[model samples]
Target: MLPSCKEDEYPVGSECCPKCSPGYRVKEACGELTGTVCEPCPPGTYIAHLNGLSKCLQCQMCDPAMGLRASRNCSRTENAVCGCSPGHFCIVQDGDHCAACRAY
Candidate 1:
């Protein structure tokens, strides 16, 4: 239903503009967005940042009761959010970050 962009663009200075992937986020820098725009990855969630840094980051409550995962997934690019990994906590529905404690 949708397939027309001069065969897609993005190849100027390129940083991650290889036509934009890895979750998606392009509107003019990576190439040319407006294809309906998509930007949803919030909540106590995370993104596991890297040197490819651009956005996605929030996770930071990893231990309020037990154990889980909230950090240690990201490496570079300014840390890459997600923080809290010791006996985990911070949860409400599984986790992309915290909510662990359940092994003892």
Candidate 2:
């Protein structure tokens, strides 16, 4: 059986590679003799947890046409949080963002 990886690590081929911390993503997987490579997420992207993913998730936008406004700006490690705009109330919630809104 392959050796087990730690909670913060994932398997890469026959080797175990450490996961990147929040705000970063894997640039290269570990080779037999090398450590994992990671890079900071670029603008409009984020990784909120330790991960072995190659790319960051895209940040959500608060669309004015959807009657949504940003409650919290997105950062390297957190997705944008959206709230209902003036004269509206939340009709649907999608984690930190309001998926839909209704007139008050």
Candidate 3:
């Protein structure tokens, strides 16, 4: 099993590195000794500030079945923010899904 880092560090291979900034990923896992190996997330991933995440969170996809669309495109620093389409509303409170406004 992978060991966990304390509230102040991020895991890399077996050692830990200081948490990458809000919108970046560790491009290269250098030794515990560090010097800015962080880089931005590619296509569909993000990292909110103060994260010890070993991987970038996957970007959320807006559901067409629920009549929802991407309001804010996901960035390296933010998740793909979603909102109801013209005639839709949210059914689930969790940020993962949405519902049709007409279902009400």
Candidate 1 per-residue C-alpha lDDT over 1-104 given as tens digits, one digit per residue, 9 for 90 to 100: 43333323433343323343334333345436533232434444344322123355543554534544544543221233343355443444455533445442
Deviation in Å, model 1, residue 103 alpha carbon: 9.4
Clash-forming residue pairs, model 2: none
Ranking by lDDT: 2, 3, 1
Q: How close is candidate 1 to the true structure, as a TM-score?
A: 0.26
Tell me the lDDT of candidate 1. 0.39
What clash pairs does model 1 have? Answer: 66-87, 67-87, 67-88, 67-100, 67-101, 68-88, 69-97
lDDT of each: 0.39, 0.89, 0.71
Model 2, position 84, has a per-residue lDDT of 90
Q: Please identify model 1 stretches exceeding 4 Å from their true place.
A: 5-54, 57-61, 68-72, 76-98, 102-104
Which residue pairs in model 3 clash with each other? 88-101
lDDT of 1 at 88: 40
Per-candidate TM vs. native?
0.26, 0.79, 0.63
Report the lDDT tens digits of candidate 2 across residue range 1-104.
54688889988777778999999999999886777899999999999999999999999898878888888889999999888988999888877557877888
Q: Candidate 3 on 41-62: residue-level lDDT in tens?
A: 7778888876655578888887
Clashes of each: 7, 0, 1
Off by over 4 Å in 3: 1-16, 30-34, 52-54, 89-104
Best-to-worst order by TM-score is 2, 3, 1
